[PDB]
Design a protein around this ligand. Structure first.
Ligand SMILES: [Zn+2]
Ligand SMILES: [Zn+2]
Ligand SMILES: [Zn+2]
Ligand SMILES: [Zn+2]
Lengths: 800, 310
């Protein structure tokens, strides 16, 4: 089997091919359309069948159709497919190789004969047609056995014998070089670099050569046992190694009839001979097994397809898949795909899951959208942002808003104990004395039925549930106006006013809600009848089957009256569960409920547990579990800055802050980074007033002109503290720098914005490459017409 | 999917984003580097500059930190690392928009991977070639960014591979300012974590087990704030190994490595593996022609969510 690619014939996009059947009896001319990957693109055109045993084949580039075919008996046949002459040597012997040059010169490789030349080069136009024998123009390599040859140029031929490798020019009777090597078999010139050819040997050892190294002699590469062995014994060998006609420094090797290894080479110049080494090998499994020989098919956009001949002689076409070589992810969740075959790069922007859906629902783009929308700066604004476009984040920011308003109103910070952003667990569980903490809690409250009533009042203050009847009516009106009638009825039952809940839910629109209120109405008399009587049964079933969590709560409380079925499911607000566990519960079971819920939320990592834990080290542990669950470092940092460096110091909070700042820089949200920094500075004010935030250090230490010392070791006039001398003057007006209320208006290149620009233009500004100072408006007005520093004797383009 | 032609005449080898995610640098075997900017108005990738860089095929490029300026490293097979600084006073698509700074003619072998250290470690470099020598280049003199000094020279491989045998190398730094300096270095079949000791020299810290075949890609996940680090590795086998690292002679902290997962979904060779900004989405390419996206579940097990055929 021999598949030989033939060029310079077709004028259309089709690529011609020549094939020899595995029984070595016919030569078939094909025509392959590369743009169509179907197996019907191979078109069989002609078949010459009068052949004994083909050993070699060659084609003519200049004249279309002229194909030479060698044979083991010794008959070389030159004919057309798209005349017919049979030729042979003077002494008949087997033909191993064959070459047709561009100018019609024909070479021939024969076996070893002691009285004849094995490299006969002759032209067919000066050949006597009355004789089968050939009279050669040039005779070389007497008493030798040439096994493979290839025409390099219009005059030079590269011939390989059984023990030598030669390049013989027809213009000189002395060969150019003779390098003794045993890897002298089928020569395939590189189509992109004629100085490189690759042969193999009897042991299967492939070798890629350079002619210049042999000219001057080691091979450029050597692969041990890459191709089939037994090259001397068998004269009918399939071609399992091919150079690449689609790109440079590449070759395909077919192994065991199943896989094709596309070796890609790398080159470096020792400084013009490029030393070679193997970079990457790509394995492609064939469509059908038992492939003996194969060849390339060049397609458009640097594509690759392979035409292969099986051991049964069936010839098919197989494409090469586009294997992705690089899949990188952006900070905006954008995927960029690079191929191993073509040049184009594929991009999936954010604009089994769909990839766009997964990258749009990822927490990285969620955090980017929230940071661009302004998340975390004001908790009321976060609540409005969440409501305007999951819900547990709203519930855990409502508590942050409540505690921050309480601290900023001075309600909690009074007394000797700060107790800002404190947790319900820490407050109700106690911990310099019990009497001292009781009396300071009493003085906080002054602003029972239980041994600890002041602790309950502190817990209601922290939870934001210290409300009166008018406050509850106002909350009912607010929730009714917001449209969550189910939540309004749930809150009415949480307070314990079931006729009020019936009145609220019945005065709605939706008939479904009116029916629900009608069902709830039942309880207003079904209170003294403890017994299964269907109504409770149907209500339990409906509490199981309804979808709304507040209605589930309202039915589970109405039927089989028990507070514990309300405050254990996670479908409702933890603040509401604390509100019903603080208003109607005994202190013996409240401790058990608080311990169970705290030990739940700390290991679960829910943000709603900040009700119980506060901004404490236990809160930092809760936020750490939340980060380990979700990678929501944005919410972790924006919650942590509400009292982590103000009250303690842990490395995890600083890590989250630095990570969020780096992410904000990566999204180019520098304004939001600055707002985060000023919020961190503002929320680090202690009870005394000492700032605890690690602020950015100073970058300017102006040296005084007179005293020659540091001025930083006056809101409108800055002077040196050591001697009183003012700042260096401007280079445009020779007025001192750093002082406002200048006797002129620096009108440098909505009147409030204009006034801000006019008052901003009179600030300090200096070049950092020549150290010359200007006013901001002076520099803006001066650099719009000049490109040199205004100080005399300075050559520094301060603009760019 | 919107494909845009990069314009190279040969195979595009490495593509890297910048820190801000609006610039991509593409190297190729046509001895060219191209930088593409993402236009804000047209929302299409457009070319910024395209200049010839090396005398051989470029295989790895990296952007520097944006607080040190705009510097692109370039490691090619001609045993050179070239550092390229942008001077904005040149016309676009001209070849003079990116000025050459320094050539690192110390590598005796064809360089495979180049990486910048994070910005808190200084303006550092990390080079690796088939000589098996890991080199760290700093930038000590701040006046000129052309005097780059070799400081750390650690040998990863005992002898270089022969030319006929293939090889692959990859590097990954530690994106953590709150952890000591670490470096994930991938040899032929080995993955070594190198840590900076108290003596100022790198030392062998930990080794990732497994890896019966060639390692094609290594990637250290960003530490979003968790207590465990993640290294993703794509081998010549079908395995996307994710290693979970917990950090606690002459080393500031000893570290333990436990294999978190091992996935054979690609059925081939995992050519590239990467991470997201937050370490939640992994991306892995393989010989199946499909790029898989992996996200961790509730039980800390990574499960595939999307498959993108090409
Ligand atoms: Zn002074
Ligand atoms: Zn001035
Ligand atoms: Zn000046
Ligand atoms: Zn200047």
């Amino acid at each position: 089997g021999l598949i030989k690619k033939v060029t310079h014939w077709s004028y259309d996009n089709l690529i011609d091919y020549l094939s020899v059947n595995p029984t070595r009896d016919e030569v078939t001319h094909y025509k392959v359309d590369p743009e169509n990957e179907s197996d019907e693109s191979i078109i069989k055109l002609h078949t010459v069948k009068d052949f004994g045993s083909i050993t070699c084949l060659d084609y003519s580039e200049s004249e279309i159709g002229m194909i030479g075919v060698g044979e083991k008996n010794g008959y070389l046949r030159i004919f057309n497919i798209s005349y017919d002459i049979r030729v042979r040597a003077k002494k008949q012997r087997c033909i191993n190789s064959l070459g047709i040059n561009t100018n019609g010169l024909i070479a021939m490789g024969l076996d070893r004969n002691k009285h004849d030349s094995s490299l006969q080069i002759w032209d067919m136009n000066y050949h006597d047609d009355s004789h089968e024998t050939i009279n050669p123009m040039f005779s070389y390599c007497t008493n030798e056995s040439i096994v493979s040859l290839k025409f390099l140029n219009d005059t030079s031929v590269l011939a390989a014998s059984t023990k030598f490798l030669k390049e013989i020019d027809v213009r000189s009777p002395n060969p150019i070089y003779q390098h003794p090597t045993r890897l002298t078999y089928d020569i395939k010139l590189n189509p992109f670099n004629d100085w490189q050819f690759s042969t193999y040997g009897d042991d299967g050892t492939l070798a890629i050569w350079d002619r210049r190294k042999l000219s001057d002699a080691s091979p450029l590469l050597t692969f041990e046992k890459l191709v089939g062995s037994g090259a001397a014994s068998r004269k009918y060998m399939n071609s399992c190694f091919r150079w690449s006609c689609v790109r440079n420094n590449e070759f395909a090797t077919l192994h065991r009839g199943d896989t094709i290894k596309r070796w890609r080479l790398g080159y470096y110049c020792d400084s013009n001979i490029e030393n070679l080494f193997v970079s990457s090998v790509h394995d492609t499994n064939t469509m059908y097994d038992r492939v003996a020989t194969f060849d390339y098919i060049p397609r458009s956009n640097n594509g690759t397809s392979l035409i292969c001949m099986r051991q049964s002689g069936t010839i098919y076409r197989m494409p090469i898949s586009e294997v992705c070589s690089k899949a990188i992810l952006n900070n905006r969740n954008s995927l960029l795909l690079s191929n191993f075959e073509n040049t184009e790069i594929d991009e999936i922007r954010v604009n089994f899951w769909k990839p766009e859906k997964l990258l749009e629902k990822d927490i990285s783009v969620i955090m980017r959208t929230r940071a661009s929308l302004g998340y975390g700066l004001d908790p009321m604004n976060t609540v409005e942002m969440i409501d305007s476009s999951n819900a547990y984040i709203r519930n855990t920011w409502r508590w942050i808003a409540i505690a921050k308003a309480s601290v900023d109103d001075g309600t909690m910070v009074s007394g000797d104990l700060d107790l800002g952003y404190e947790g319900v667990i820490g407050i109700w569980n106690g911990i310099l004395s019990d009497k001292q903490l009781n009396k300071e809690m009493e003085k906080i409250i002054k602003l029972a039925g239980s041994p600890k009533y002041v602790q309950r009042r502190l817990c209601l203050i922290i939870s934001g549930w210290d409300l009166s009847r008018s406050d509850y009516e106002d909350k009912y009106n607010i929730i009714m106006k917001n449209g969550h009638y189910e939540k309004a009825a749930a809150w009415a039952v949480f307070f314990g006013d079931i006729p009020k809940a019936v009145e609220i839910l019945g005065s709605a629109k939706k008939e479904r809600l009116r029916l629900i209120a009608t069902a709830i109405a039942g309880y207003l008399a079904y209170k003294d009848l403890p017994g299964n009587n269907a109504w409770r049964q149907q209500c339990r079933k409906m509490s199981s089957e309804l979808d709304d969590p507040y209605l589930r709560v309202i039915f589970a409380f109405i039927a089989d009256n028990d507070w514990w079925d309300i405050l254990y499911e996670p479908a409702i607000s933890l603040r509401e569960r604390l509100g019903v566990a603080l208003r109607f519960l005994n202190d013996t079971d409240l401790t058990t409920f608080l311990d169970r819920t705290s030990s739940t939320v700390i290991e679960n990592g829910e943000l709603e547990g900040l009700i119980l834990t506060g901004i404490t080290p236990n809160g930092i542990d809760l936020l750490q579990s939340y980060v380990n669950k979700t990678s929501d470092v944005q919410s972790a940092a924006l919650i942590s800055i509400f009292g982590s460096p103000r009250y303690f110091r842990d490395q995890r909070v600083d890590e989250w802050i630095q990570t969020y700042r780096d992410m904000l820089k990566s999204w180019e949200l520098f304004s939001m980074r600055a707002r985060f920094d000023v919020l961190r500075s503002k929320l680090s004010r202690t009870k005394t007033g000492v700032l605890t935030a690690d602020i950015k250090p100073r970058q300017i230490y102006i040296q005084c002109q007179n005293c020659k010392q540091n001025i930083n070791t006056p809101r409108h006039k800055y002077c040196c503290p050591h001697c009183g001398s003012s700042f260096p003057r401007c280079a445009i007006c020779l007025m001192p720098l750093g002082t406002s209320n200048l006797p002129f208006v620096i009108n440098g290149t909505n009147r409030e914005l204009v006034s801000r620009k006019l008052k901003l233009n009179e600030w300090f500004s200096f070049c950092l490459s020549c150290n010359h100072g200007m006013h901001a408006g002076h520099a803006e007005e001066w650099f719009d017409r000049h490109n040199v520093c205004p100080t005399p004797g300075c050559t520094c383009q301060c603009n760019k | 999917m919107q494909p845009f032609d990069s314009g190279h005449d040969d195979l595009v080898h490495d593509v890297v984003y910048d820190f801000y995610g609006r610039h991509v640098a593409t190297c190729s075997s046509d001895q060219h580097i191209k930088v593409f900017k993402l236009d804000k108005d047209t929302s299409n990738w457009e070319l910024s500059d395209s200049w010839r860089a090396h005398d051989s095929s470029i295989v790895a490029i990296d952007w520097a930190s944006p607080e040190y300026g705009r510097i692109i490293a370039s490691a090619s097979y001609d045993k050179t690392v070239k550092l390229w600084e942008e001077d904005p006073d040149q016309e676009e698509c001209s070849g003079r928009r990116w000025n050459k700074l320094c050539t690192l003619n110390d590598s005796k072998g064809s360089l495979y991977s180049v990486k910048f250290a994070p910005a808190h470690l200084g303006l550092k470099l990390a080079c690796l070639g088939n000589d098996g020598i890991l080199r760290l280049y700093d930038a000590l003199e701040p006046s000129d960014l052309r005097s780059w000094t070799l400081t750390s020279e650690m040998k990863v491989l005992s002898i270089p591979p022969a030319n006929h045998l293939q090889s692959d190398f990859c590097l990954s730094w530690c994106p953590s300012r709150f952890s000591p300096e670490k470096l994930a270095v991938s040899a032929l079949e080995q993955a070594i974590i190198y840590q900076r000791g108290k003596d100022g020299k790198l030392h062998v810290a930990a080794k990732l087990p497994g890896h019966k075949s060639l390692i094609r890609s290594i990637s250290w996940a960003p530490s979003i704030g968790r207590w465990y680090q993640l290294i993703a590795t794509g081998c010549k086998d079908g395995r996307i190994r994710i290693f979970k690292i917990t950090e606690k002679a002459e080393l500031q902290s000893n570290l333990q490595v436990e294999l978190l997962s091992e996935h054979d979904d690609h059925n081939g060779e995992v050519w590239s593996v990467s991470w997201n900004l937050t370490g939640t989405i992994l991306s892995s390419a393989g010989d199946d022609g499909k790029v898989r996206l992996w996200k961790a579940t509730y039980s800390n097990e990574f499960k595939c969510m999307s498959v993108i055929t090409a």
